[PDB]
Design a protein around this ligand. Structure first.
Ligand SMILES: COc1cccc2[nH]c(C(=O)N[C@@H](CC(C)C)C(=O)N[C@@H](C[C@@H]3CCNC3=O)C(=O)c3nc4ccccc4s3)cc12
Ligand SMILES: COc1cccc2[nH]c(C(=O)N[C@@H](CC(C)C)C(=O)N[C@@H](C[C@@H]3CCNC3=O)C(=O)c3nc4ccccc4s3)cc12
Lengths: 298, 299
């Protein structure tokens, strides 16, 4: 089991660059609209606390340079939606895939296509942390890179990149420009909440272990959901939701291990430790594999 | 800092499905040729001891069903180059990138595009182990998936996938059909040579960990090149060459830590352990990042 991104080609066909003055960020070109972070209109002096509405009233369609490679796409309209800019262009992207905009939940994973001046540079899988950061790899000029999942040739875009916190993790928005977590698009030092372990993903990891014959940790106990949640919080693990119980369903069916029985097994792991014994060859409990990831890799 | 793969679009547009009889695997469509593992011709009986030139001479052009998406491409010629079959089709692939076929060295990395039935499924980064295996993620039907590097719009193909060892590591060939390692395309349980750790990569990775603001493992000591190799070889690490020292220069210059200083650091980590602490979140020393990988990602 290793971290596996989705193939990036459908997304690559949509990466463009958007320039205002000398600031160039990445943008996403779908049909005749280009989506990009709104602070591309920011001057260096205007970033400590920008008045975006005032800054945008001064801009015109001809102030925006949108380029697919070195080819210019003429802007014919602009509007702001939360923290993203929506630039209407005169050409429908012929490489537009079937697509959706979705807001993901903590614990869900997605692939990030790291881009610079519109050129793709790399692809990797990320997990949204419970404190709404992602442990990404982003340099200067990466803003506007997107994160995504592909189900049956349809690309669900879920992330657009905006910021690196002082701790080195990263923060961004969905494709409607709404931040994940309590961050804002200002050149300020912001702190995320304390992070926690993604319980639903650890349980999926335990199911993967069982599937592969590693099952020493299975006990004869069960628990109620509420009892497990109260114990999980004491170990800085996320509480389980009903949605978490449901997405663990296929793995529970495949192994014949009830979700609450597996919760009692993890509960014993938290209270008593791993005893130098390993699970899937590891002494640490992995938490960035979703139940879909586990099913994908099997 | 994360295991990062090349964007896979240029390769995706080349992946097709190839069918002979009851067998289906993936092929690579470049210009007017499709490359795939030769044992797509093997029936279940053939697989234990296939006489490949004999099995292939008894196949005609119309025995091969090549599908590109929903379209079928017509095979108009075929030949075998070692463990790879080359099917000449009557249609050129317009999405053919600029490309080259290369044979990587152990310790080098590449991106794998895992495919099933000619459909791309996932992309992740692999390293050619010293024992010529790769720790990949491959299932039934993945044969014919390829590994590659990219360098300014030029795709350097280096690996085509052929098998999973009983230990779960993977084995395959370059695009000339020659295996990496002592393996052979027959249906048998095969063991690899004893693996060792890619030392130059571990060092590159500790530099990456310092560029990302983690330094707990550093120390005051230095070591000589030979004294480090003595300890390294004792722990089943590959020897470090002066070329490797040079290759690590840019990372040494950036962080101002001399290579043999970092070698002293690694030597202590090997003799004392990690004492339950982690480096870049990992509990184990990582050796699947080359010096080029860390530089490309960090700068
Ligand atoms: C004293 O202020 C701080 C104190 C402590 C930590 C801090 N972090 C940031 C911060 O992140 N700012 C945002 C920008 C804000 C407006 C969202 C930002 O630079 N995003 C980067 C991606 C960054 C850069 C390095 N790799 C990361 O992912 C990006 O691509 C963009 N470049 C520009 C250039 C010009 C105009 C717009 C953009 S948007 C500020 C900051
Ligand atoms: C007693 O024999 C064993 C004992 C102990 C461990 C073993 N491993 C293998 C072994 O790997 N076989 C080869 C096939 C050989 C001929 C190269 C193989 O590649 N199958 C897959 C990829 C595999 C499968 C699971 N994930 C891996 O990546 C593939 O795509 C192909 N399927 C077929 C099906 C029919 C014809 C050609 C191909 S080629 C045999 C074996």
């Amino acid at each position: 089991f290793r971290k596996m991104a989705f193939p990036s080609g459908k997304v690559e066909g949509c990466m463009v660059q958007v320039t205002c003055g000398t600031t160039t960020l990445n943008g996403l070109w779908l049909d005749d609209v280009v989506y990009c972070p709104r602070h591309v209109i920011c001057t260096s002096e205007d970033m400590l606390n920008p008045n975006y509405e005032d800054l945008l009233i001064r801009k015109s369609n001809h102030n925006f340079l949108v380029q697919a490679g070195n080819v210019q796409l003429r802007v014919i309209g602009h509007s702001m939606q939360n923290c993203v800019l929506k630039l209407r262009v005169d050409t429908a992207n012929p490489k537009t895939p079937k697509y959706k905009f979705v807001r993901i939940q903590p614990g869900q994973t997605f692939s990030v296509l790291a881009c610079y001046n519109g050129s793709p540079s790399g692809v990797y899988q990320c997990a949204m942390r419970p404190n709404f950061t992602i442990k990404g790899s982003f340099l200067n000029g990466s803003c506007g890179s997107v994160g995504f999942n592909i189900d049956y040739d349809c690309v669900s875009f879920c992330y657009m990149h905006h910021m690196e916190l002082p701790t080195g993790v990263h923060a961004g928005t969905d494709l409607e420009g709404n931040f994940y977590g309590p961050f804002v698009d200002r050149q300020t030092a912001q702190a995320a909440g304390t992070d926690t372990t993604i319980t639903v993903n650890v349980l999926a990891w335990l199911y993967a272990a069982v599937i592969n014959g590693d099952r020493w940790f299975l006990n004869r106990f069960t628990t109620t959901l509420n009892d497990f949640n109260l114990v999980a919080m004491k170990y800085n693990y996320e509480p389980l939701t009903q949605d978490h119980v449901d997405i663990l369903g296929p793995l529970s069916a495949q192994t014949g291990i009830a979700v609450l029985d597996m919760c009692a097994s993890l509960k014993e792991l938290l209270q008593n430790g791993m005893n130098g014994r390993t699970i899937l060859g590891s002494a640490l409990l992995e938490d960035e594999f979703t139940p879909f990831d586990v099913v994908r890799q099997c």
